[PDB]
Scaffold this active site. Structure first.
Site, PDB file in Angstrom:
ATOM      1  N   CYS A   1       0.725  -1.376  -0.001  1.00  0.00           N
ATOM      2  CA  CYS A   1      -0.165   0.095  -0.015  1.00  0.00           C
ATOM      3  C   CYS A   1       0.983   1.328   0.099  1.00  0.00           C
ATOM      4  CB  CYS A   1      -0.979   0.021   1.119  1.00  0.00           C
ATOM      5  SG  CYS A   1      -2.007   1.722   1.303  1.00  0.00           S
TER       6      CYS A   1
ATOM      7  N   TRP B   1      -9.339   6.144  -0.502  1.00  0.00           N
ATOM      8  CA  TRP B   1      -9.720   6.926  -1.691  1.00  0.00           C
ATOM      9  C   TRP B   1      -8.892   6.618  -2.791  1.00  0.00           C
ATOM     10  CZ3 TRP B   1      -8.365   9.811   2.732  1.00  0.00           C
ATOM     11  CH2 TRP B   1      -6.908  10.333   2.813  1.00  0.00           C
TER      12      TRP B   1
ATOM     13  N   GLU C   1      -5.485   3.438 -10.853  1.00  0.00           N
ATOM     14  CA  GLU C   1      -6.340   2.497 -10.368  1.00  0.00           C
ATOM     15  C   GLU C   1      -7.251   2.014 -11.360  1.00  0.00           C
ATOM     16  OE1 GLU C   1      -6.782   1.194  -6.256  1.00  0.00           O
ATOM     17  OE2 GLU C   1      -6.071   3.445  -5.806  1.00  0.00           O
TER      18      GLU C   1
END
Ligand code: HEM
Ligand code: HEM
Ligand code: H65
Ligand code: H65
Ligand code: H4B
Ligand code: H4B
Ligand code: ZN
Lengths: 413, 408
Positions: free
Chosen positions: B107, B279, B284
């Site tokens: 992440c 968010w 992506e």
């Protein structure tokens, strides 16, 4: 370790199976507890260390030519053995040297272009004794491989290491690079990445033009002696000026690049023998120039200037002005090269061919080690097929290895 | 060993000590690296784990070995002893969840790690209960465009027979339909799941962007379908700031990225249902969702409307279409005041975050394969940043898809 490892492609669902990893000969840097796959870089061999290493190579050679366990095979083992026992080392046969070099390339997990691994012209420069001789051999390599723009992949191999105090070394990390000059005000001229090396050349006696694209001289070390400077004949250095198929202004940027990508700082390891000077060359993938050389911040860094001429809003990042300029720069690079009929491959074609190569290698060889971090192109990653391809990394031998920069290790006479 | 990591662009070197704390495996050996492979309890197993977590908890509030610590250790021991499990304190639940994010090596958004709103749903017993909790999650985290990070934590695993699972891999996704003529409507990645909903009583609008229904399993029972109220599902029409024709492509996406298929592990406890949401980073949607071949696959169409020469690969028409498509996504979200980050900003922040972590924590596990954005790699700073990857607990882990293990 498990006998079978499976790799998936997530775009196509294709699953390949790997047995080749079992022949892994060295450490990757990773452990069960930590992975170092994004880490860039994670005294002679004894008689006893050398015996098994050569047998391993020889066996694999005779296995390749379908003569394993043959008379010729056992004779070669016996000959090598006697030679190591009597001389503390041995000499490769020409056939073995060529096989070794092609397989070093085949085994290069960081190389996206291995589909070509078996087409490699090998020049045997083991009879070389002086730096001037190295210069001749190298020039001959440059000319043969450049081939007026129809590049041919090739390697020139100098005498193996003996005691460590007599290494042959090309001090340039690549045969053809541009100079870098640090100014008193802290600005750099040329390719900022080569400032340190440029300074050594100037110290050694080089007269520097102090331009933006000055082809560096060769710094060549034979038989452990101090290195000597040579200027590659300019007519042997093929160059391509960068223009753009749409923006007539792009040529105003005054950009060019050399046609021949030729790495000269790696060590070739065959059957326990170490070839510390083994310059090898292929042809460029476009991104290498258009993305890394041109747009890295610590390189030529042309992004801002190209963006300005593209008239792009450059106050926000979310306008993606960098990205937009990056694409055009790379269109230019590929365009200029094709126009001058100098071999180049775009990242789409290159990565597609590698997937085909990789699939074929699983088929015939039982695997194909690959370093994803290097294979995936530095732009447009996920729109190339390799981004989706799971890869296994491991080090097979023969291999190309990193080695220390020689100016750190050299003992001056 | 202390381990060094270099950034090659800035020549900054950090020293990693944190890695000496991991006990979980990575998948690699000394001889093989699987860094690009996607997917590489009893009273006796459970206590040491419990001990470690509680220990590391009390260590983090500066009361290691305290009376609070000692009794908690005693409390937890007696509980595993007599019930074959134990329950976390609320303070422990929140910390555990924040740190599983903090340790998520894949992440890039971890700079936000401690701004996480935690919703305790351990009192849930039914799928109706689950739907209510998730709706509250969606509404809170969506927040009318100004997105807020959140996680909703349902009852832990007990005996594997009574598992809480959200069946959708994400809370919000679009349906995918298998056409007669071989093609596919909607999101092709979701076709199997989409079919399972239809096979369960979902009446599909058969559109290109039909929000799937929720499929919730509570306490091991059959899952039940629920339609999220539409006013809770924020979407964004994608338009381009120069290409006025872009809006005619008919593209929209949802604002709330919410992963619901992972397993949150804390102190040897297993939370099989823990939808979490942040968010979007633009790529992506713009790169992966819209332009993967197996996804919405719009590169060709866009390149057509841009009139690009699409004959040879070396025109980089694909790359060109890619950048424009991403500009639109960022532009649309920004224009609707819906939180979004571009890959330039996200990566900067991540490098900044890494620095923080090394400084105050002695490291920061990071998976370079996942951290590097899927377009314009080497012009983002993470490309040039060496990262070490290792597995710290608490953590988010993968789990099997529920439709492969469920006994109806
Ligand atoms: C024939 C066309 C070739 C193509 C298109 C190609 C492509 C590439 C590319 C794009 C890289 C990454 C370079 C970088 O990022 O610095 C690379 C690396 C590499 N290539 Fe190839 N290559 C070719 C030929 C060769 C040959 C002939 C050899 C050796 C005989 C070779 C061995 C290697 C090795 C060892 C690396 C890793 C270099 C390093 O770690 O610095 N390649 N190749
Ligand atoms: C707050 C803003 C956030 C941003 C901008 C962000 C960014 C990202 C991105 C771009 C990915 C890659 C996703 C993919 O490629 O499928 C990702 C993955 C991930 N994120 Fe974050 N994230 C955020 C919040 C969170 C939160 C709130 C959590 C947990 C509470 C979290 C935990 C994870 C995990 C575990 C993954 C890997 C998921 C997987 O392996 O499939 N992130 N993040
Ligand atoms: C055999 C071969 C083929 C190929 N396509 N590229 C290479 C690399 C060529 C190359 C040339 N000049 C400079 C470099 C640099 C680029 C920047 N890197 C950080 C270090 C290597 C690399 C080698
Ligand atoms: C917490 C979080 C934050 C963020 N910015 N993105 C994510 C990923 C969210 C996400 C949403 N819908 C769908 C997916 C899919 C996309 C395609 N991938 C192959 C699998 C995940 C992923 C999660
Ligand atoms: C830190 C990271 O390993 C480093 O930047 C790598 C990433 N991938 C690369 N890939 C290629 N082809 N060449 C490189 O120099 C690099 N650099
Ligand atoms: C094979 C490879 O691991 C796979 O394509 C990965 C690559 N990197 C990724 N990176 C991110 N952020 N998300 C992904 O889904 C993937 N997929
Ligand atoms: Zn690894």
């Amino acid at each position: 370790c498990p006998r079978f490892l499976k790799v998936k492609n997530w775009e196509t669902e294709v699953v390949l199976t790997d047995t080749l990893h079992l022949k892994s000969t060295l450490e990757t840097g990773c452990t069960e507890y930590i992975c170092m796959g994004s880490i860039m870089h994670p005294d002679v061999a004894t008689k006893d260390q050398l015996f098994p290493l050569a047998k391993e190579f020889i066996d694999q050679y005779y296995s390749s030519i379908k003569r394993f366990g043959s008379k010729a095979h056992m004779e070669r083992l016996e000959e090598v053995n006697k030679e190591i026992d009597t001389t503390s080392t041995y000499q490769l046969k020409d056939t073995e040297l060529i096989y070794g070099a092609k397989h070093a390339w085949r085994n290069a997990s960081r190389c996206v272009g291995r589909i070509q691994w078996s087409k490699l012209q090998v020049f045997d420069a083991r009879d070389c004794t002086t730096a001037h001789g190295m210069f001749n051999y190298i020039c001959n390599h440059v000319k043969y491989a450049t081939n007026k723009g129809n590049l041919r992949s090739a390697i020139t191999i100098f005498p193996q290491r003996t005691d460590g105090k007599h290494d042959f070394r090309v001090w340039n990390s690549q045969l053809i690079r541009y100079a870098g000059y640090k100014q008193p005000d802290g600005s750099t001229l040329g390719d900022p990445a080569n400032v340190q090396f440029t300074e050594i050349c100037i110290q050694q006696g080089w007269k520097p033009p102090r331009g933006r694209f000055d082809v560096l001289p060769l710094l060549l070390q034979a038989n452990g002696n101090d290195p000597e400077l040579f200027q590659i004949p300019p007519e042997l250095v093929l160059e391509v000026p960068i223009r753009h198929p749409k923006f007539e202004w792009f040529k105003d940027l005054g950009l060019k690049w050399y046609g021949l990508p030729a790495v000269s700082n790696m060590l070739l390891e065959i059957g326990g023998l170490e070839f510390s000077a083994c310059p090898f060359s292929g042809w460029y993938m476009g991104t290498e120039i258009g993305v890394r050389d041109y747009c890295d911040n610590s390189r030529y860094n042309i992004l801002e200037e190209v963006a300005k001429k593209m008239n792009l809003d450059m106050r926000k990042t979310s306008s993606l002005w960098k990205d937009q300029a990056l694409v055009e720069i790379n269109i230019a690079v590929l365009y200029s090269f094709q126009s001058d009929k100098v071999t180049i491959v775009d990242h789409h074609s290159a990565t597609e061919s590698f997937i085909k190569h990789m699939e074929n290698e699983y088929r015939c060889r039982g695997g194909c080690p690959a370093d994803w971090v290097w294979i995936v192109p530095p732009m447009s990653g996920s729109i190339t097929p390799v981004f989706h391809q799971e890869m296994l990394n491991y080090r097979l031998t023969p291999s190309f290895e990193y080695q220390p920069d020689p100016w750190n290790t050299h003992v001056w006479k």
